[PDB]
Design a protein around this ligand. Sequence first.
Ligand SMILES: Nc1ncnc2c1ncn2[C@@H]1O[C@H](COP(=O)(O)OP(=O)(O)NP(=O)(O)O)[C@@H](O)[C@H]1O
Ligand SMILES: [Mg+2]
Lengths: 96, 239
Amino acid sequence: FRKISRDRGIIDKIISSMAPSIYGHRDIKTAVACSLFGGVPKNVNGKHSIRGDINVLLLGDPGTAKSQILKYVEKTAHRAVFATGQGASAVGLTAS
Amino acid sequence: SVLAAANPIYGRYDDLKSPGDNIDFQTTILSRFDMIFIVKDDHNEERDISIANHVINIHTGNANAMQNQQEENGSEISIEKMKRYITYCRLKCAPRLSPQAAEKLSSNFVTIRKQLLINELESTERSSIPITIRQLEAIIRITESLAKLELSPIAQERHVDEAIRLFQASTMDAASQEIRRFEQELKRRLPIGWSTSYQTLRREFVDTQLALDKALYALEKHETIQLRHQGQNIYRSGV
Ligand SMILES: Nc1ncnc2c1ncn2[C@@H]1O[C@H](COP(=O)(O)OP(=O)(O)NP(=O)(O)O)[C@@H](O)[C@H]1O
Ligand SMILES: [Mg+2]
């Protein structure tokens, strides 16, 4: 990891490596990469806590690999959960 | 105490829509809030630049040192000391109103009630944001709390001024929110760069009658008119 991190193109090689069997959509691959690495969560003297996670919406037409991208991210992330549409209730998403 | 946070219907406030369409809550539950703030993104560029510099100073970690300097300078106090101080104020003091404070509050109540009445007439419907005798007690509680900060055993004129100001800044501001013939008459009869003294316009329009002040509010929001000279001179400033 330390070796490959030195590469000048490493951000682009990571982004190209996101969902490699999906053609194009480099913007989606970038958004997914940013989300999957995430920001830094912060807490200002304990008096104000700030989100580090990056939330992403894939809005668009049918047959454009959006569901496949999400299944890939379920494959790749160290803790992941997947819940389609009508299959998710309010308490089934947060807590019950 | 109930502190509640909510979004309007349509999420963003949707300013050109009626408040009775934007607000989900019934007038019953709304009346139980001493202060209702309607919060809007102003989109002013100077403000947005200022907020951006501030938020960057947060995320860079500069703010960790800034708050500590502010606390040691005595311009701010910490969570812990403020928590104890709220407890101390809640246990030591419970002030009354002086007679002068009581009269100012009473006359203020009839004043805001009159404002709500005329607004309900001008919009020909009962207002969603209400002003009720329960909301007089809201200004009373706020007055007392303001005196309760300094542990003054009575509230005074100054505390009532601040309580009235806060209620005006919050609940009234929430409540605050054929003419097409008269506006083009005024555009025809007052050309660019000249002044009509207001009372003569009132006499002329009456001689043709409340459409006048709607026309002035619309034309004053636009660049076309400017209410110069203590509102006495209607000045066709713009187009
Ligand atoms: N750029 C692409 N490269 C490879 N396969 C693709 C591409 N775009 C779509 N597909 C294929 O299209 C099929 C459907 O993908 P899917 O992820 O369900 O699309 P979607 O964006 O979710 N459409 P929808 O579910 O109707 O909103 C999959 O079998 C993908 O392999
Ligand atoms: Mg899909």
